[PDB]
Amino acid sequence: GKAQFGGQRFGEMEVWALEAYGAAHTLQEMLTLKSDDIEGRNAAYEAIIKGEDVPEPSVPESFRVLVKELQALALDVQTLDEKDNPVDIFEGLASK
Amino acid sequence: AAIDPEEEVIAEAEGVVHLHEPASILVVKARVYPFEDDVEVSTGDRVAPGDVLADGGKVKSDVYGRVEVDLVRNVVRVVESYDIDARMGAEAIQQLLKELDLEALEKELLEEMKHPSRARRAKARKRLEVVRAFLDSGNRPEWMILEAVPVLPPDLRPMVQVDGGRFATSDLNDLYRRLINRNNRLKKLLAQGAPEIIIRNEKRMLQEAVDALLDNGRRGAPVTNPGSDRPLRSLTDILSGKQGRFRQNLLGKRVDYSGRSVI
Amino acid sequence: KDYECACGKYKRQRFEGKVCERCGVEVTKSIVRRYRMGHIELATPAAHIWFVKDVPSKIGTLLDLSATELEQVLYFSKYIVLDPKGAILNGVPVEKRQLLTDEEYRELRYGKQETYPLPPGVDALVKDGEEVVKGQELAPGVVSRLDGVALYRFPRRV
Amino acid sequence: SDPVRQYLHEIGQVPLLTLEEEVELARKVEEGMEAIKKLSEITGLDPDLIREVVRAKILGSARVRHIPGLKETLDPKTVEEIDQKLKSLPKEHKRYLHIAREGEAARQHLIEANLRLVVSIAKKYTGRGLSFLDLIQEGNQGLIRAVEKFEYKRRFKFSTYATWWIRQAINRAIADQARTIRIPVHMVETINKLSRTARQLQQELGREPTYEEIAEAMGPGWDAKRVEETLKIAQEPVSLETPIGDEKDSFYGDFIPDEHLPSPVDAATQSLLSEELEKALSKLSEREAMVLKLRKGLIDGREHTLEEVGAFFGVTRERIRQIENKALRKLKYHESRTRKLRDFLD
DNA sequence: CTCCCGGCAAATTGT
DNA sequence: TATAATCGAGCCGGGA
RNA sequence: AAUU
Ligand SMILES: [Zn+2]
């Protein structure tokens, strides 16, 4: 909303449009650097004010929210690599 | 014997005693075993036929039952009853789930798969699909019962001061609080040896608190904040639906570098 | 607060990983309050409602328990027998995974008994300690409903 | 299907006590506690440990668990040992075991027989922020208390003594658990008093009273400022999930900015600032740059006194003041030259 | 059959 | 801490 | 409740 200085909602149907165009990098930007990817949006802004090209995105924070919410439900959600070894998308912050 | 020294009945001289006009008569289905010397079992003990009761082993029990040591009638009663193990609640179910050999049940269910009747084969399949799910996955069935309940990180259920210095907080905090209160009270009631009726009530209330936390409204009346009809928003409600985590923050988002105007 | 413990003994990043002895807080990024989970240790296990109430129930299906049966055990309406210990009820032996009501469980576990009120002033026909058959008369208006040992409750006159 | 209705049915399965039966159980409980006291003397065993062992055998194999205050883990090994040591007593001593056992049994029965009393008291306290079943369990907690303190000799009926303990327990529950932000019971007492008073003032004045009018009505010690601060403290938080007007398509938490995490601009700005600050401090000697960092808190987060910086570099408090001004002066010179740090002053 | 649970367009604004 | 108080108050499709 |  305008009163909160809000951003526009790029909703499911809008994502379908980017998908049908096959615009994968445009879409990924919507999902990360221009939204909830915190590391990405900070780095992307810094690059633009320095004249560099925007960096490749990181994990959307709302996926991390989804993971923890499923843990609160006693469901174990594991991001795995091709070797089926766990990948830590919390970068060591959540493990003792 | 009585409250004060007077009004007591003290035997005037030598005599024998007879009891009359009792308030009520208690008929117990039990066995009575009189004893002259010392009794080796104390009252409340559970006993099977042949167990030694009193007088160094002379007197023993004929039935299965519960020990009542009568120091007035100088008799050891055994109330007919068994040491039966029967439970209620998620604890019983957790036990039955631990006692599952899934390997065996697959074998049994495959044998059931050869039966001519269509329904027999159908139900054995659906069960077998659940059996096989656990078998293939490596999940232990007793995990469907919770012992430790996870707590979501605080920043995902925040307590934040809004602009005016007022506080706004997520409904999950109230759902957890109900849980914690009921769990703690349960611990206290156990340490204080409450009767089973009281411990049972606490346990079923504990189940409901877990139920509202995970999926409120799913079973029974939905939990509400006081003086509001609004169901508290549980973990299931957060994940699912148009307003849920998936269709709101995951398949679509608000974005930066965007604007709007009249065309 | 980032790299700052609660009481403020260690306030900057030179300490990262220290756990303040006084206040007990780790010196790291405050972002972890989005990540680190707590837990509650239940006194009694509690069932996860998805695996109970999501049809066809997964718990019910593994254990061959219907929707009604699983409700009744979980919500403390009925006992379910793990080990009959030779129990028998109504002439037939109690078999494991059988559902018992409260009356059935109490009769099995604690035994069956009954107490009969005596009209005021009326004196008993049988004497205290005396074995009694079912149907036998205890008092002018009192008839016993079960076999067993009769016991005097409160003698008004000795 | 209704948890309350269910509980009401289970309590109705325990018949109420006769005057005789009430006294018998109460009597057996008192005598039983006395037996446990003596068993302590004879055996030299903690009275609580004996009490828990006696209680363990009465309730059955069902309930065996560790008890807090007790020093020993309470498990069948220890309860057999301790019960077997109690059964190792001579006949005249061993009689106290039988008494304690019957005491615990009678206590259980006494409690169970009074549960309907708690219900009728609890029903009156609904609507104060605890659910009916929550009030009943806390009331039951008080009922348990009443059985341990009851003196049957005084000839008062039990309902009389219990009611005090049950009412006390429910009221503590409401004061302790009803608020998301928990408040001390006495403070809760004051707030309710403040409420009652204002309701009186509004009933006589025909309009809402001022803070000053309440402060007078409250007596000495109270001015309007304190009346206001008390009400501020009494404010309960509001749900982040409260729906905003229109369709149910917007929640209140959605309109609240995150003031904590730095914004992309802020992250950029603070980072650039940390980098320019270091570029200027390396242009200072190591000895005079370290003093400035210790004094402004860039190391350790605290702004150290002049005396403390003297101890770590082992010099005089005046010497450390001198290198800070010459360090700061040299810093000032490099700044007038490169114009690097000026724009971060906003 | 009956019942019980899951669905029921998008973006925007306004008190 | 003691008179006595004892049981509440929207339509639709699909799958067991 | 509006706008398309
Ligand atoms: Zn600290």
Write up what this structure looks like.
The structure is cut from a larger assembly and holds 1 copy of chain A (96 residues), 2 copies of chain B and 1 copy of chain D (346 residues). With 96 residues, chain A is mainly alpha-helical. Chain A contains 4 helices and 3 strands. In chain A, strand 2 and strand 3 form a beta hairpin. Chain B has 7 helices and 13 strands. Chain B is 35% helix and 19% strand. Chain B has 263 residues and is of the alpha+beta class. In chain B, a hairpin with a 4-residue loop joins strand 5 and strand 6. Chain D is mostly helical and 346 residues long. Classes of the chains: A mainly alpha (96), B alpha+beta (263), D mainly alpha (346). At the B-C interface, strand 1, strand 2, strand 3, strand 8 and strand 9 of B face strand 1, helix 1, helix 2, helix 3 and strand 2 of C. The structure holds zinc ion (ZN). The structure holds 3 DNA and RNA strands. Chain A: The RNAP catalytic core consists of 2 alpha, 1 beta, 1 beta' and 1 omega subunit. When a sigma factor is associated with the core the holoenzyme is formed, which can initiate transcription.
Number of helical regions of chain B: 7
Q: Looking across the biggest beta sheet of chain A, what order are the strands in? A: 2-3
Task: Give the C-alpha Rg of chain A.
Answer: 16 Å
Major beta sheet summary of chain B: 4 strands, antiparallel
Which strand-content bin applies to the residues of chain A? 5-15%
CA distance, first residue to last residue of chain A: 41 Å
Order of helices and strands of chain A: EHHHHEE
